[PDB]
């Protein structure tokens, strides 16, 4: 299953890519902010996206909304430090399928990939 990893932190993108590949998924690409995420989603058409919230230019909520427009069946797991109730509600409302708060343990990423 091909995954696009979206996060502005080079280290996070690095560790997620490592977990995803070792769990048997294929890393399709990476994006570093919300605009790029929509750009890459169009280009790559991944099966699954992992989505940070706090990013320069355009945040994760708006990128979710943008990808859902491109593809109503997009499968997006949020992976963010912004684990407040109101942010989880907003991300799920926008169309994400799952939400993992940072710091997280790697098994929760795996089950989220499976779930979608």
């Amino acid at each position: 299953k091909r995954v696009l990893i979206v996060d502005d932190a080079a280290f996070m993108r690095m560790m997620l890519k490592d977990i995803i590949t070792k769990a048997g998924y294929e890393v399709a690409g990476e994006a570093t902010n919300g605009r790029e995420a929509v750009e890459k989603y169009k280009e790559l058409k991944p099966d699954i996206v992992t989505m940070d919230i706090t990013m320069p230019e355009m945040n994760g909520i708006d990128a979710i909304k943008e990808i859902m427009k491109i593809d109503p069946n997009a499968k997006i797991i949020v992976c963010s430090a912004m684990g407040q109730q109101a942010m989880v509600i907003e991300a799920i409302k926008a169309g994400a399928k799952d939400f993992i708060v940072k710091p997280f343990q790697p098994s929760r990423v795996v089950e989220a990939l499976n779930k979608v």
Binding site: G83, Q84, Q85, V88, V101
Partner: peptide, 16 residues
């Protein structure tokens, strides 16, 4: 005001 992952798993189920 950040929730736990169990808190979130819970909240997600509620939302479905």
């Amino acid at each position: 005001d950040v929730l736990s992952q169990e808190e979130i798993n819970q909240l997600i189920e509620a939302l479905m």
